[PDB]
Motif scaffolding. Structure first.
Motif, mmCIF file in Angstrom:
data_model
loop_
_atom_site.group_PDB
_atom_site.id
_atom_site.type_symbol
_atom_site.label_atom_id
_atom_site.label_comp_id
_atom_site.label_asym_id
_atom_site.label_seq_id
_atom_site.Cartn_x
_atom_site.Cartn_y
_atom_site.Cartn_z
ATOM 1 N N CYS A 129 0.851 -1.185 0.000
ATOM 2 C CA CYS A 129 0.000 0.000 0.000
ATOM 3 C C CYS A 129 0.892 1.242 0.000
ATOM 4 O O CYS A 129 0.569 2.264 0.610
ATOM 5 C CB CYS A 129 -0.908 0.005 1.240
ATOM 6 S SG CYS A 129 -0.043 -0.096 2.836
ATOM 7 N N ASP A 135 -8.683 -1.289 -0.924
ATOM 8 C CA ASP A 135 -9.994 -1.696 -0.436
ATOM 9 C C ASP A 135 -9.942 -3.104 0.142
ATOM 10 O O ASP A 135 -9.780 -4.078 -0.595
ATOM 11 C CB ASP A 135 -11.019 -1.661 -1.562
ATOM 12 C CG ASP A 135 -12.384 -2.098 -1.099
ATOM 13 O OD1 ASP A 135 -13.256 -2.343 -1.958
ATOM 14 O OD2 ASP A 135 -12.580 -2.195 0.134
ATOM 15 N N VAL A 137 -12.250 -4.894 1.191
ATOM 16 C CA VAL A 137 -13.336 -5.712 0.660
ATOM 17 C C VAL A 137 -12.924 -6.349 -0.668
ATOM 18 O O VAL A 137 -12.895 -7.572 -0.797
ATOM 19 C CB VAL A 137 -14.625 -4.865 0.456
ATOM 20 C CG1 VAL A 137 -15.670 -5.665 -0.296
ATOM 21 C CG2 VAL A 137 -15.182 -4.430 1.813
ATOM 22 N N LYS A 138 -12.590 -5.516 -1.649
ATOM 23 C CA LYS A 138 -12.185 -6.009 -2.962
ATOM 24 C C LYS A 138 -10.986 -6.955 -2.899
ATOM 25 O O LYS A 138 -10.992 -8.017 -3.520
ATOM 26 C CB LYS A 138 -11.864 -4.833 -3.886
ATOM 27 C CG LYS A 138 -11.536 -5.242 -5.314
ATOM 28 C CD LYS A 138 -11.004 -4.064 -6.127
ATOM 29 C CE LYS A 138 -10.683 -4.481 -7.555
ATOM 30 N NZ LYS A 138 -10.280 -5.916 -7.645
ATOM 31 N N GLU A 139 -9.967 -6.582 -2.131
ATOM 32 C CA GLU A 139 -8.757 -7.391 -2.025
ATOM 33 C C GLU A 139 -8.799 -8.605 -1.102
ATOM 34 O O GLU A 139 -7.975 -9.513 -1.247
ATOM 35 C CB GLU A 139 -7.570 -6.515 -1.591
ATOM 36 C CG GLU A 139 -7.403 -5.226 -2.379
ATOM 37 C CD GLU A 139 -7.263 -5.465 -3.871
ATOM 38 O OE1 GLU A 139 -7.708 -4.591 -4.641
ATOM 39 O OE2 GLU A 139 -6.718 -6.519 -4.270
ATOM 40 N N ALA A 245 -15.835 -7.649 6.796
ATOM 41 C CA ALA A 245 -15.651 -6.207 6.837
ATOM 42 C C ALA A 245 -16.135 -5.619 8.166
ATOM 43 O O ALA A 245 -15.448 -4.799 8.781
ATOM 44 C CB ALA A 245 -16.390 -5.557 5.675
ATOM 45 N N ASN A 382 -18.090 3.552 4.763
ATOM 46 C CA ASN A 382 -19.175 3.444 3.793
ATOM 47 C C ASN A 382 -20.008 2.180 4.018
ATOM 48 O O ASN A 382 -19.713 1.115 3.479
ATOM 49 C CB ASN A 382 -18.595 3.451 2.375
ATOM 50 C CG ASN A 382 -19.660 3.604 1.308
ATOM 51 O OD1 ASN A 382 -19.392 3.413 0.115
ATOM 52 N ND2 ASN A 382 -20.879 3.948 1.726
ATOM 53 N N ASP A 394 -17.201 -0.761 1.079
ATOM 54 C CA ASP A 394 -15.766 -0.773 0.868
ATOM 55 C C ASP A 394 -15.083 -0.340 2.162
ATOM 56 O O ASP A 394 -15.693 0.331 3.003
ATOM 57 C CB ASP A 394 -15.386 0.146 -0.303
ATOM 58 C CG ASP A 394 -15.556 1.617 0.016
ATOM 59 O OD1 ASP A 394 -14.594 2.219 0.538
ATOM 60 O OD2 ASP A 394 -16.640 2.172 -0.264
ATOM 61 N N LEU A 395 -13.830 -0.749 2.337
ATOM 62 C CA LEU A 395 -13.090 -0.400 3.543
ATOM 63 C C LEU A 395 -11.617 -0.154 3.250
ATOM 64 O O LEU A 395 -10.819 -1.093 3.202
ATOM 65 C CB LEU A 395 -13.231 -1.513 4.596
ATOM 66 C CG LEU A 395 -12.794 -1.204 6.035
ATOM 67 C CD1 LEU A 395 -13.613 -0.047 6.582
ATOM 68 C CD2 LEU A 395 -12.970 -2.432 6.908
ATOM 69 N N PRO A 396 -11.235 1.117 3.047
ATOM 70 C CA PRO A 396 -9.832 1.432 2.762
ATOM 71 C C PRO A 396 -8.955 1.073 3.959
ATOM 72 O O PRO A 396 -9.294 1.388 5.099
ATOM 73 C CB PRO A 396 -9.840 2.942 2.496
ATOM 74 C CG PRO A 396 -11.275 3.319 2.304
ATOM 75 C CD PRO A 396 -12.079 2.323 3.077
#
Ligand code: HEM
Length: 399
Positions: A129, A135, A137-139, A245, A382, A394-396
């Motif tokens: 990073c 994200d 969630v996505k990763e 998440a 979010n 999503d969760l940065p």
């Protein structure tokens, strides 16, 4: 009668209505989108009763069934799978796919689950990073449950990423009705192909077992196999993503508990137990219609009237769980079962798998990334729309 479903009090909170009802009107009537009424049950004891009463039905073609949205009403006209069946049809079909989900089978699956989580975390690490947050969630939250269920069903490695993305589009809030629909139909098409293939040369997967054990002997149809496999895929995937998440966000909201988990990953099981109670991500699945008059609490539910039993409310029932609105990984559990996965015959078929996936995640995530941190202020997370089940879009994060 207030409109139902209710909206969450806030991002991570349950609807405010439940606590009030639990204390002054435990069994009451709510108004559904179409103007019809249904009985809302909020107390743990009563939810357990509704979940097991043989005088209640899950068959959606029965008038009075509590459909909560216009689409729910359309979906009710299709041929049902075991999720919408009553005995003896229910277990006759569920038994066809239960083998993979038994406690013993899931325990033997532990190494595979661990391997899957390790690989995805490592892919996240090697990528780093350095240029900003990624994200979570996505990763990670999305692929973990996705890859596991797809693989269990019989999907080959190379197809995982695409299929995982398409299934997400199904429920993504950003998706248009057309996009969500197209992706949904596309997954069914892919499953139809897999069934044809496995019928010819079966492999060691769920779809192959359905083909060999049920389709071949003529116990069920090819389309039936596709639908059962589809149910297994869409029933809890989005929920699993949301739970992972919500678990990370929750640990961030309660630093001392995160410090404890880091210091002792053996607490993962209890942390997961509390997470499934505190964040009831599937709170609208315990529904029925009364086949005949049934008494619940001080109310009489007449034949053909619908019932919605909130397991989310039951999980915050003060009479069963002391200080219910407090997230406590060291909670002293009562004899009563928390209901994050339902109750009775229909209790989540993948409860053991889901818990194993979550336990593996929270017993590994912080060992891999001890300094993992949400990259935005926690109050800015979010979350899913308040009129929907609790979850995170999503969760940065940074690590
Ligand atoms: C943390 C994740 C999950 C949660 C919180 C969850 C929750 C639930 C709940 C509350 C129900 C209702 C049970 C009832 O009728 O009393 C349910 C049903 C079901 N779930 Fe899950 N679930 C999760 C993951 C999964 C996964 C991974 C799968 C797929 C392997 C799955 C497959 C199903 C199926 C097929 C049913 C219907 C069972 C029946 O009606 O006989 N669930 N789940």
């Amino acid at each position: 009668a207030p409109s139902f479903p209710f909206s969450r009090a806030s991002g991570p909170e349950p609807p405010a209505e439940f606590a009030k009802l639990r204390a002054t009107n435990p069994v009451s009537q709510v108004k559904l989108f179409d103007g019809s009424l249904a009985w809302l049950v909020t107390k743990h004891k009563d939810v357990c009763f509704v979940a097991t009463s043989e005088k209640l039905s899950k068959v959606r073609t029965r008038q009075g069934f509590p459909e909560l949205s216009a689409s729910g009403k359309q979906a009710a006209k299709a041929k049902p799978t075991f999720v919408d069946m009553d005995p003896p049809e229910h277990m006759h079909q569920r038994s066809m796919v239960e083998p993979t989900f038994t406690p013993e089978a899931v325990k033997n699956l532990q190494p595979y689950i661990q391997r899957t989580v390790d690989d995805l975390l490592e892919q996240m690490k090697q990528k780093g990073c350095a240029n900003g947050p990624v994200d979570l969630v996505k990763e990670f939250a999305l692929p973990v449950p996705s890859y596991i269920i797809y693989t269990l069903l019989g999907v080959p490695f190379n197809d995982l990423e695409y299929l995982t993305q398409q299934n997400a589009i199904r429920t993504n809030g950003s998706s248009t009705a057309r996009e969500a629909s197209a992706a949904n139909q596309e997954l069914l098409d892919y499953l139809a192909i897999l069934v044809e293939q496995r019928l010819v040369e079966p492999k060691d997967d769920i779809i192959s077992k359905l083909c060999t054990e049920q389709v071949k002997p003529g116990n069920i149809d090819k389309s039936d196999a596709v639908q059962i496999a589809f149910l297994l895929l869409v029933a809890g995937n989005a929920t699993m993503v949301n739970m992972i998440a919500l678990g990370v966000a929750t640990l961030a909201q309660h630093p001392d508990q995160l410090a404890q988990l880091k210091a002792n990953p053996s607490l993962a099981p209890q942390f997961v137990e509390e997470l499934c109670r505190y964040h009831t991500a599937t709170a609208l699945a315990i529904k029925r219609t009364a086949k005949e008059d049934v008494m619940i609490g001080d109310k009489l539910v007449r034949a053909n009237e619908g019932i919605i039993a909130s397991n989310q409310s039951a999980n915050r029932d003060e009479e069963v769980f002391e200080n219910p609105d407090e997230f406590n990984m060291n909670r002293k559990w009562p004899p009563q079962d928390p209901l994050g996965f339902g109750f009775g015959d229909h209790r989540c078929i993948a409860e053991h798998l889901a818990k194993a996936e979550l336990t593996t995640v929270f017993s590994t995530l912080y060992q891999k990334f001890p300094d993992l941190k949400v990259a935005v202020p926690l109050g800015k997370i979010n979350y899913t729309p308040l009129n929907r089940d609790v979850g995170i879009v999503d969760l940065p994060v940074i690590f």
